[PDB]
Design a protein around this nucleic acid. Structure first.
Ligand SMILES: [Mg+2]
Ligand SMILES: [Mg+2]
Ligand SMILES: [Mg+2]
Ligand SMILES: [Mg+2]
Ligand SMILES: [Mg+2]
Ligand SMILES: [Mg+2]
Ligand SMILES: [Mg+2]
Ligand SMILES: [Mg+2]
Ligand SMILES: [Mg+2]
Ligand SMILES: [Mg+2]
Ligand SMILES: [Mg+2]
Ligand SMILES: [Mg+2]
Ligand SMILES: [Mg+2]
Ligand SMILES: [Mg+2]
Ligand SMILES: [Mg+2]
Ligand SMILES: [Mg+2]
Ligand SMILES: [Mg+2]
Ligand SMILES: [Mg+2]
Ligand SMILES: [Mg+2]
Ligand SMILES: [Mg+2]
Ligand SMILES: [Mg+2]
Ligand SMILES: [Mg+2]
Ligand SMILES: [Mg+2]
Ligand SMILES: [Mg+2]
Ligand SMILES: [Mg+2]
Ligand SMILES: [Mg+2]
Ligand SMILES: [Mg+2]
Ligand SMILES: [Mg+2]
Ligand SMILES: [Mg+2]
Ligand SMILES: [Mg+2]
Ligand SMILES: [Mg+2]
Ligand SMILES: [Mg+2]
Ligand SMILES: [Mg+2]
Lengths: 120, 209, 114, 5, 122, 56
RNA sequence: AGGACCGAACCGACUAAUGUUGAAAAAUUAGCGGAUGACUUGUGGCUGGGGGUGAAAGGCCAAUCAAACCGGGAGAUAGCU
RNA sequence: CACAGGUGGUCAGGUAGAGAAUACCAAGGCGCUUGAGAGAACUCGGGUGAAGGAACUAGGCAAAAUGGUGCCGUAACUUC
RNA sequence: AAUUCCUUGUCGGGUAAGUUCCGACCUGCACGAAUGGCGUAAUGAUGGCCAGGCUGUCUCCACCCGAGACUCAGUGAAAUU
RNA sequence: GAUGUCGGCUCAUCACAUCCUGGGGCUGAAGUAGGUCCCAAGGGUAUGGCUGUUCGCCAUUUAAAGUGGUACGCGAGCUGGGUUUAGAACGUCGUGAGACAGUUCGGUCCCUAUCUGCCGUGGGCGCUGGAGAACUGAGGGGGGCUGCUCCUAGUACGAGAGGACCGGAGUGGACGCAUCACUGGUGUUCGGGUUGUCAUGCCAAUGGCACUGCCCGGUAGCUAAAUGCGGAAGAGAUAAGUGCUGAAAGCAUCUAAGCACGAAACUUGCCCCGAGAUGAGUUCUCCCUGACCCUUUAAGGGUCCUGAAGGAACGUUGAAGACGACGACGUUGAUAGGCCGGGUGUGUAAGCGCAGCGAUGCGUUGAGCUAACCGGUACUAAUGAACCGUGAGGCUUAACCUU
């Protein structure tokens, strides 16, 4: 059964699944918009968005905590220096998912995921 | 005897002065409003149709709205019927609350049980599993034999096999009414009842008596 | 769950003292022998506590007449009359199940001299 | 292939 | 939960140290004996010069179990080991003249009042 | 394990009666770009709900 | 010193599961035996079918062995299907 | 067969280690030529388990368990 | 008894209960002395039996992590008839 | 030109020549307990030691541990211990190769389900206008076991010993259903400890890998060992059986006419499915009130206008689920995520200071972190539409409403 459970297995083990989202989370921070499969984008919200909330308050402990979850100082600097201040007023919902058809290689349903403040 | 429709709030413990702990399922029974009364001369049997709760008017269909408007009642979660005995009579639009069970000692609670989905014979029918070792080959929890060779040459009706389990109407009988709280529309019954939290629930006086 | 929450809150004991795992706690529990009620004391080390509001409970371990005994008390049950902290112990864990494998000197617990 | 003697 | 082949310590001074349960009495297909239940036992180890000897087949009443005992309020009482008191096969009365270790309240029956009177604790 | 008789043309046809595909009921029309697209999906030129969400 | 001991490489193949239209016409995985010797291995050579070789199982002699393989007698014979 | 097989030599880094075992790495080389979802039964490869502990079974099959260094200590039987 | 048909021979030990096992008896159907008799320390992936530890082997299964099964896209078999 | 064999395991189904429970007649039936026969198949109807065994003996239970059929039920379900391939040996027979319902040690169990069958779950069409709901219940299935203690009562009975029927109450075993409040398991998505090594420049702090590296705890969910409930009363017609009145047959006679009682069997009562019940049922609401054209002039075809109730599709999703299906919701919005608060779990984070040569300790501090949970919040995603479905619904007869 699967009653009241959360988190997609995505046909991966725990180690691979954790590593993949760490890489994907850094990509979304580095590139404000990325293209991924629809189910993967839905799971990425539960990983990237907490990091942005963590970046709301700038402190040594928070930066180290963010580093432990991203293992990329460039991402940590991006989160606390730019993303944190930009989303300081938003109460969640820092990312938006847009469906963009299906993948030619395997017909997988794709979707764009981007930060809501990409406007320039 | 007429019953009421409620919702499964959850399970809770009730302590008593003597030191006994009574596990009680909390059932909320809002005002049950009678929507239609079935008459022998018109429907062939005596019964009442009632509705409980409320639902957003945006999702109320026109044919459903007219039925409620006929009795001058607000749309509810759904419609349920209760058969009437010889001495029972009700009027359309009447509101029935949990005080009906104030003098009732035993009740029968019916509801849709939890849905287990496709279940094997071991879980569904308590089939004994075969040896996990000692040479067993891909038959650790398979059903096993299902017939008796040529003579019957077939599988009989009702053979116990894997299939959908749960998610069906189930009735539990002779549950003690621990407490009736009319001020809060709450009914406490000793023991568990079918269904998950928030599922529709039907409570009737114990027919077994 | 507001309905459930207030139902339990209305019957939760208010005089529950503060204690931690590893503390030596004496529990007064009502016992009935015929028509007369009585109080008997159960003193031991608190090895486990679960906080669940009205469903909170704690486990007390003692060695009685050479036999280890563990009692799981329902914190808010009327059966237990009172709880008293005789001594405070210093432990690094919430659960002290490892004490089940120890006796005598090995089972000693340091005092929490805050 | 089973036998029968 | 005491089954067949389960080894239990002896809570009385009858001379037996530990016994094996060979039958859970009181029903058909019954497989568990709790506190206060009678079980057929065989003595596996005993002291010399005791009133019982190794290999004897008797019946005993379970007084302590690891699984524990459930109280009306939901509390549980557990012991570090399983213990029993030997009883006469024909009269099912206690054989030993003393009881060792604590005893549990569900022995409060007219047929076990002797054990409670000798019980050091409750 | 294996068939004892050869299934007919008829049997094959009725088994495939449920294999037919279903066409999309309709295509949404963007309020600004006017291009047809799957509902709740961005258009070919990156428009969605009247906004050019995608740069390309 | 050792057909000595424990144990990798190396050479074996005792148990179990999987596989059995297999990844594989004999394997994989986890254990297992020998591991300075009657050991193991590379290259080349010799023994040819009623013969070879065989610490001997009728084992092996090119996925074939109580008489190899290829061609020939040959369209053997078949009171049988 | 772009096949979980078979195939003789030479080179032999770092930390821990008795070690060419094993673990993580360097130089270097790879992710094994269908993917994307779902998280039913059942099958396969594994993890954990209340109380009991061979009651299983043809049989403790399989699993679990023991597991290293020094030091103390070690019986019958021995062809010593 | 790797030998005993009668046979689960009889007696003793082990177990609450032992057609197996160990010891003994001799009524050896049908042991026996280099196609060797009887012993034998050590050795054995050897046969039988018992005990401690150990455990999902089991009472009685429960949950969980992965690869299939299931759905979608691509490619696309087989025995049989 | 193949129907695999004993026994075990799993799963069974039927018969009644009935093992237990139920109802009776006799008894050399005082009571308790038995013997024998009749009715009764609804439910129930042991775990172990030895042996490959079925069987059997033995140990200890039980209300009882029934007898049989079903390819001596069941290997395209499992096992392979026993017989019965090739190896080897003993005894025995034969000069010998070999041989033995003689014995010993070892010894490959293949098949992706087309059909029937069965367990589940959908699509299509039908039910005569269409649509949304709630129902009647023809039919079918599930369930049906039983111990002990107490009271009646140490009463009836009996010289004593011993010890009830009939009726009540309580508490159990086995089995079934439901559920997580409790007690627990699991909890590789939550904390913490720790070994080796590598990396982030280094210290500090962290991360990767080693079965989740090895471990200690644990939220939700699932779950049993956990805790609630269930078997029935009652009614109808009866079996064996017991009767009332009563002739044939002046009597007698339960029977021929006519009445009464009578069991876990039967029909109901209880639970579940159920109008594909084509015999396709009933009740309550909702929706549609246009133009014409053609001849093969009839339940006829076609164009224009129209597109309702409702459905579907898509999207966010569920304690619903293999996929379909089913339930919730789509801005007039709490469906999911995030966010805020709280609760849980872990157990005093990091940084800094103070003590110590140091490991480390202490203060800040029950700190930090915290998954699925609880109560909230439109911050993100659930689009304005399109699509399907129509336009008053056949004939005959009858009864009313009428002209
Ligand atoms: Mg996949
Ligand atoms: Mg890992
Ligand atoms: Mg479900
Ligand atoms: Mg196999
Ligand atoms: Mg297996
Ligand atoms: Mg068969
Ligand atoms: Mg037939
Ligand atoms: Mg050697
Ligand atoms: Mg190997
Ligand atoms: Mg070696
Ligand atoms: Mg031979
Ligand atoms: Mg060959
Ligand atoms: Mg010729
Ligand atoms: Mg020819
Ligand atoms: Mg390849
Ligand atoms: Mg290596
Ligand atoms: Mg799985
Ligand atoms: Mg266990
Ligand atoms: Mg057995
Ligand atoms: Mg083994
Ligand atoms: Mg192991
Ligand atoms: Mg034994
Ligand atoms: Mg002997
Ligand atoms: Mg001889
Ligand atoms: Mg050897
Ligand atoms: Mg495909
Ligand atoms: Mg044939
Ligand atoms: Mg009946
Ligand atoms: Mg047979
Ligand atoms: Mg068989
Ligand atoms: Mg065999
Ligand atoms: Mg023969
Ligand atoms: Mg460091």
């Amino acid at each position: 059964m699967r009653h009241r459970k959360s988190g997609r297995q995505l046909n991966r083990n725990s180690s691979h699944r954790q590593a993949m989202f760490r890489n994907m989370a850094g990509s979304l921070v580095r590139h404000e918009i990325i293209k991924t499969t629809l189910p993967k984008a839905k799971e990425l919200r539960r990983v990237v968005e907490p990091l942005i909330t963590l970046a709301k308050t700038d402190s040594v402990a928070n930066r180290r905590l963010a580093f432990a979850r991203t293992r990329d100082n460039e991402i940590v600097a991006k989160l606390f220096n730019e993303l944190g201040p930009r989303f300081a007023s938003r109460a969640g919902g820092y990312t938006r998912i847009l469906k963009c058809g299906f993948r030619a290689g395997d017909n997988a349903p794709m979707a764009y995921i981007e930060l809501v403040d990409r406007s320039e | 005897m007429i019953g009421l429709v409620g919702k499964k709030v959850g399970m809770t413990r009730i302590f008593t002065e003597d030191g006994v702990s009574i596990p009680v399922t909390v059932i909320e029974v809002e005002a049950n409003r009678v929507t239609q009364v079935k008459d022998l001369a018109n429907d062939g049997y005596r019964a009442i149709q009632v509705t409980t709760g409320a639902k957003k008017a945006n999702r109320v269909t026109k044919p459903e709205a007219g039925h409620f408007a006929k009795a001058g009642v607000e749309a509810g979660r759904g419609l349920w019927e209760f058969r009437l005995a010889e001495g029972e009579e009700f009027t359309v639009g009447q509101s029935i609350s949990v005080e009906l069970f104030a003098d009732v000692k035993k009740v029968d609670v019916t509801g849709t049980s939890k849905g287990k989905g496709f279940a094997g014979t071991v879980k569904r029918w308590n089939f004994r599993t075969q040896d996990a070792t000692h040479g067993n080959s891909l038959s650790h929890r398979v059903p096993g034999s299902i017939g008796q060779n040529q003579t019957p040459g077939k599988v009989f009706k009702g053979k116990k096999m894997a299939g959908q389990m749960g998610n069906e109407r189930v009735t539990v009988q002779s549950l003690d009414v621990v407490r009736v709280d009319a001020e809060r529309n709450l009914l406490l019954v000793k023991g568990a009842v079918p269904g998950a939290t928030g599922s529709d629930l039907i409570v009737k006086p114990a027919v077994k008596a | 769950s507001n309905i459930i929450k207030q139902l339990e809150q209305e019957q939760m004991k208010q005089d529950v003292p503060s204690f931690r795992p590893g503390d030596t706690v004496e529990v007064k529990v009502w016992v009935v022998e015929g028509s007369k009620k009585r109080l008997q004391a159960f003193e031991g080390v608190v090895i486990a506590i679960r906080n669940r509001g009205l469903h909170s409970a704690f486990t007390v371990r003692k060695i009685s007449n050479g036999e280890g005994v563990e009692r799981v008390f329902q914190t808010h049950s009327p059966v237990v009359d009172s709880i008293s902290v005789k001594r405070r112990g210093a432990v690094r864990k919430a659960k002290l199940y490892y004490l089940r494998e120890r006796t005598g000197k090995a089972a000693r617990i340091k005092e929490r001299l805050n | 292939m089973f036998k029968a003697f | 939960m005491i089954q067949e082949q389960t080894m239990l310590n002896v809570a009385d001074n009858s001379g037996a140290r530990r016994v094996m349960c060979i039958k859970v009495l009181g029903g058909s297909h019954r497989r568990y004996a709790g506190v206060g239940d009678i079980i057929k036992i065989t003595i596996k180890e005993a002291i010399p010069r005791g009133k019982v000897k190794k290999g004897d087949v008797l019946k005993a009443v379970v007084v302590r179990t690891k699984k524990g005992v459930r109280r009306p309020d939901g509390s549980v009482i557990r012991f570090d080991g399983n213990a029993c008191v030997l009883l006469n096969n024909n009269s099912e009365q206690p054989i030993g003249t003393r009881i060792f270790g604590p005893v549990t309240r569900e022995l409060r029956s007219e047929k076990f009042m002797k054990i409670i009177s000798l019980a050091p604790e409750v | 394990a294996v068939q004892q008789n050869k299934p007919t043309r008829s049997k094959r046809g009725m088994r495939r009666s449920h294999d037919a595909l279903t066409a999309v009921t309709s295509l949404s029309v963007d309020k600004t770009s006017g291009e047809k697209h799957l509902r709740h999906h961005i258009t070919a030129d990156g428009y969605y709900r009247g906004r050019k969400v995608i740069a390309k």
